[PDB]
Amino acid sequence: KKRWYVVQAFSGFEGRVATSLREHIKLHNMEDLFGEVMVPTEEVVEIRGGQRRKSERKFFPGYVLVQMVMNDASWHLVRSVPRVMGFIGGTSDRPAPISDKEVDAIMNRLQQ
Amino acid sequence: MNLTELKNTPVSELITLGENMGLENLARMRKQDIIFAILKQHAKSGEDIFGDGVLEILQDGFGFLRSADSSYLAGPDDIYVSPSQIRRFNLRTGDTISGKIRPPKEGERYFALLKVNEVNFDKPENARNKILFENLTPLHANSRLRMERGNGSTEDLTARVLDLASPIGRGQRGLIVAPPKAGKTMLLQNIAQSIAYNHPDCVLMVLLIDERPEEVTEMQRLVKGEVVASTFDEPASRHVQVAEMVIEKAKRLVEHKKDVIILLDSITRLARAYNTVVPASGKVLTGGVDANALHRPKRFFGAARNVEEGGSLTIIATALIDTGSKMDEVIYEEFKGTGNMELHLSRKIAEKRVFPAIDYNRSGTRKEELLTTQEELQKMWILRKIIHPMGEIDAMEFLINKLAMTKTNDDFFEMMK
Amino acid sequence: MNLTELKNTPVSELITLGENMGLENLARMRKQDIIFAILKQHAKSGEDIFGDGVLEILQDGFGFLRSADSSYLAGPDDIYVSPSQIRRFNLRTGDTISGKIRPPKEGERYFALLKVNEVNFDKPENARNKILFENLTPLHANSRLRMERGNGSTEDLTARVLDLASPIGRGQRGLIVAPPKAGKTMLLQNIAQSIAYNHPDCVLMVLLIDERPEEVTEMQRLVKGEVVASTFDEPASRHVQVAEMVIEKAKRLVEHKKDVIILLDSITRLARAYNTVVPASGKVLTGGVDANALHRPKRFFGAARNVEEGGSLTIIATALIDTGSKMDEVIYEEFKGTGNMELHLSRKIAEKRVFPAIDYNRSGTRKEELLTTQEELQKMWILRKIIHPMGEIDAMEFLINKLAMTKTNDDFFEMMK
Amino acid sequence: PPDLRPLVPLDGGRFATSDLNDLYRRVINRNNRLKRLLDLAAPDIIVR
RNA sequence: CACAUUCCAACCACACCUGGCGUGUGGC
DNA sequence: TATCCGCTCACAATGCCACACGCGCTGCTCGGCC
DNA sequence: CCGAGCAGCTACTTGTGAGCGGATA
Numbered sequence A: 001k002k003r004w005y006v007v008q009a010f011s012g013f014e015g016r017v018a019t020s021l022r023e024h025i026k027l028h029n030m031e032d033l034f035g036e037v038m039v040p041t042e043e044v045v046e047i048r049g050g051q052r053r054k055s056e057r058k059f060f061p062g063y064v065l066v067q068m069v070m071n072d073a074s075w076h077l078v079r080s081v082p083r084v085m086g087f088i089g090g091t092s093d094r095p096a097p098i099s100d101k102e103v104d105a106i107m108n109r110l111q112q
Numbered sequence B, C: 001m002n003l004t005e006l007k008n009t010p011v012s013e014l015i016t017l018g019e020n021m022g023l024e025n026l027a028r029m030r031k032q033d034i035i036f037a038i039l040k041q042h043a044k045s046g047e048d049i050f051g052d053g054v055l056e057i058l059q060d061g062f063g064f065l066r067s068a069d070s071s072y073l074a075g076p077d078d079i080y081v082s083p084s085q086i087r088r089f090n091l092r093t094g095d096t097i098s099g100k101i102r103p104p105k106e107g108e109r110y111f112a113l114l115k116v117n118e119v120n121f122d123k124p125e126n127a128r129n130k131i132l133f134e135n136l137t138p139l140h141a142n143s144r145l146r147m148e149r150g151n152g153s154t155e156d157l158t159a160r161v162l163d164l165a166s167p168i169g170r171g172q173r174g175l176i177v178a179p180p181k182a183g184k185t186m187l188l189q190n191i192a193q194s195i196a197y198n199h200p201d202c203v204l205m206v207l208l209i210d211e212r213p214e215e216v217t218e219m220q221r222l223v224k225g226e227v228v229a230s231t232f233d234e235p236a237s238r239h240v241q242v243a244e245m246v247i248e249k250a251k252r253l254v255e256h257k258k259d260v261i262i263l264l265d266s267i268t269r270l271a272r273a274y275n276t277v278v279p280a281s282g283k284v285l286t287g288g289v290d291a292n293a294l295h296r297p298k299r300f301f302g303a304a305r306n307v308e309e310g311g312s313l314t315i316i317a318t319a320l321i322d323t324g325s326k327m328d329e330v331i332y333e334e335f336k337g338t339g340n341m342e343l344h345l346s347r348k349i350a351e352k353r354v355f356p357a358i359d360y361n362r363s364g365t366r367k368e369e370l371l372t373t374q375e376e377l378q379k380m381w382i383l384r385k386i387i388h389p390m391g392e393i394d395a396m397e398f399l400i401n402k403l404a405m406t407k408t409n410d411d412f413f414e415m416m417k
Numbered sequence D: 001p002p003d004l005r006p007l008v009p010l011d012g013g014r015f016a017t018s019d020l021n022d023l024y025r026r027v028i029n030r031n032n033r034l035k036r037l038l039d040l041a042a043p044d045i046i047v048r
Numbered sequence E: 001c002a003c004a005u006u007c008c009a010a011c012c013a014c015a016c017c018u019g020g021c022g023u024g025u026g027g028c
Numbered sequence F: 001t002a003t004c005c006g007c008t009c010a011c012a013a014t015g016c017c018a019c020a021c022g023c024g025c026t027g028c029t030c031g032g033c034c
Numbered sequence G: 001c002c003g004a005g006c007a008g009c010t011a012c013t014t015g016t017g018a019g020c021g022g023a024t025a
């Protein structure tokens, strides 16, 4: 089952690490083991005004939790790509994914 | 307890009301401090307050709700709103909002908006379903805005000649070109009266920029409509501020599919203001105006258009000429060919004390064929051909006499046969 | 998913389309943000995008692809292109390009051009095999551009008198000299209609500089051709920008051996703009115009010529006179003897509401012998000799009557015998 | 105490700061981020 | 009526400066 | 299950003085009741 | 969009003492 595991990256490089891991997944043609990035930085919070009304697609903690199937090859692939300093989870090295309640919570944060 | 209920009644009612509520002498405070202290002491008895006002965006992110009592300026009774409400309910400048309010909580100094109930006279649920202004498809004016009262009063002539000189429509672009002390004020007052009588469905607003306070106080109680003004008591920062306020109010209202009609007096004062608040860009021409100092008047005036989906924005501003300073002239210069309808008043006719002093053939309306019917257009052409060979002054007198004999313009047209 | 497919359809189709795609309320954004978010969410499903647009060179080296929806300006949906592509495929201002595009990648904010597929409606392989503009050998106009429809409609007269007053050809240099409110707009609209009907092979483009938005929206849906405009809502920087955009588009297209016809309205507005964006050089003459402030209008107008290898660039601009300000006059002054063809419209004829109000003998075309045949030229000389002793107004009426009796100008010529 | 923390205006826009200042600033940053995450009902593993 | 202070001929008050820390080198 | 043995981690290693020098670039994130 | 502050781009010491298993009776 495609579980939603959490991964931490270098401070600021969250989207860059997301695109790097996507290119790595498309590289070793292992799409049957992973899902998508699910970048939770849906924080369109902006500051508008005199000639300056751009948006900010940022303002979120450095977490790029990815939907995937936990496996030896999958873990070694998501760790082989650099800038993956953080693999959160209480474990030796094989953690437990997130539950469906927080899945729907972050989905609501995505929609809002 | 609503904000407008204390917003509209005069200062005397506020005095007796606060003296009844057992207050410190409220006669020592300003109107805004009067309403502020009264709402404070009312909430101190345990009531949840309701309020209303027009929103202004600030560059720090949050917004402030102003009223027409302060002419849309900063005051102690302005209602603070967080940027996150502006996000969720899609707020912006010009959105008039009424709903649940409370006084500033512990350590704060401005009212807070709890619960939105009316966004531009609409449900806040559909307020997010709006169309923007620049994405609009403008058009020419098709619907005729008849200015004639039909009762045949003495001053009503100055309106009927309107229907004979320069037709108006929903979304028209009109420029009043007249020297000082020619009769623009009475003309504008009659315009406002006729519009408020014949078309009470469209919202009517008037701009007074750098005017005299007596004119303001006479205007605010002669027209049936909410008026805003700014005298010379205040810096041009206030004038530009109220300018964004009124223009964004009109924009949001026409986005809500409403017909807005703004009467601006005068565009020369507004141009002077915009020029004096704009920083120097090194581009100076004759008169002392910066090159980008006119971008804001151009914006305010080009805001006028006729929308196709519904609603329109008519903007009728007066410009001043023959004031002895070339700078004013240059302003009028760039506003020469920008408008499609003009009311030319010559001082030569007003010098004889014959009113209204309107230059007929120097006035006109572009694409006026879509505003009137075929019979009316043919009669207008015949009247223009009759008045063209004669001069300005006694020819205007001829029109005034031919208008005063008949009751409405139907009898005048039939007699012209 | 192509850029033009969302570029041309109105805002309403974009609304329903995004509401179908399960979007945040797109009614809160601008047209450019609408297309931007829709293309974002489309690529988020995994599609490679195609796009198109006209290139603009920047001084930092890279280029940006603009559309006619933004009137060739900066926007969120502009396609970024690296300078190295401009090097390899020999790009420059005016080169319209269509090909593979993707949304901005991780951390970027503008679309990127992957793969070039069409450079000015040509293969990008032959795009490097082009001839420059200044190395061209200009000539006079030889091919006749017949403006007469031949159907004999009521307004078609204003076109037939064209073929009788001032002939046009491929690469002609024409100046419309007329006071305000004389009938230049309807004339230009008929010109555009007749060209798009009789010569659909040549590309047709129109310039509207500092005009009213109603005229823009009426023009963009009356002619069969892609139009660009710039109202007074915007600073003169926008006007000069769209000026380079359109002139370089015409230049690249005529370099690609295509016949370009540009109708500019009005050159007085463009001269005012060029004067107000140019810095002061200490050289001021009467009117308030810098000496080098006219170099850019001179450049834009001298861009017109007739190429020998193939293709041509016809530029027909209108100038304003009798506007009360001497500055305008001075502009027309330096544009007096620069054009080889002129359409003189006098307000004296338009004052009687008889259209078209064209001054016959004050109008004319230099070297018109190479545009028409011998019979046509002799008949033109005879008509000029017949109309010369009479005045302007009722002589124009005489031409209008003699034109309205016959169906096309062949019957008129045969009757003139 | 603030003045007990070495922070002197160096030559130019730069300031000669102490090593404790960076520590306190990082502590405050992570504390504020944690307080933000607790309000948004972040996942248990994230707040962990 | 009461609380509380009173904005200006010499001059008193309005002064005077980088070891945060590390590294390198040398001497005792 | 007690208890000696082997592996692992915290702590230490003058003092003074003199001179000289240093902490960058691109990139990322947070800053704001008038 | 603007400005302000802050982050990514190891092994020749040896000795002493204490603590934590650990394996042997």
Ligand SMILES: Nc1ncnc2c1ncn2[C@@H]1O[C@H](COP(=O)(O)OP(=O)(O)O)[C@@H](O)[C@H]1O
Pocket: B155, B158, B178, B179, B180, B181, B182, B183, B184, B185, B186, B187, B190, B355, B356
């Ligand atoms: N319809 C009208 N009826 C009566 N008087 C009029 C009318 N229109 C203009 N006037 C005259 O015009 C004058 C306007 O004065 P003033 O406000 O100084 O001119 P302006 O409006 O140019 O500032 C008034 O004295 C008034 O008598």
Ligand SMILES: Nc1ncnc2c1ncn2[C@@H]1O[C@H](COP(=O)(O)OP(=O)(O)O)[C@@H](O)[C@H]1O
Pocket: B366, B367, B368, B369, C155, C158, C180, C181, C182, C183, C184, C185, C186, C355
């Ligand atoms: N061929 C025509 N037939 C009928 N009316 C015309 C014609 N040409 C011009 N007009 C009249 O002239 C006006 C044109 O206005 P406008 O386009 O603003 O002229 P300009 O652009 O010269 O100022 C219209 O109101 C229209 O009624």
Ligand code: BEF
Pocket: B179, B180, B181, B266, B320
């Ligand atoms: F007094 Be007026 F407005 F010139």
Ligand code: BEF
Pocket: B337, C179, C180, C181, C182, C183, C184, C185
């Ligand atoms: F188009 Be008009 F001549 F201003």
Ligand SMILES: [Mg+2]
Pocket: B181, B184, B185
């Ligand atoms: Mg007045």
Ligand SMILES: [Mg+2]
Pocket: C184, C185
């Ligand atoms: Mg026109």
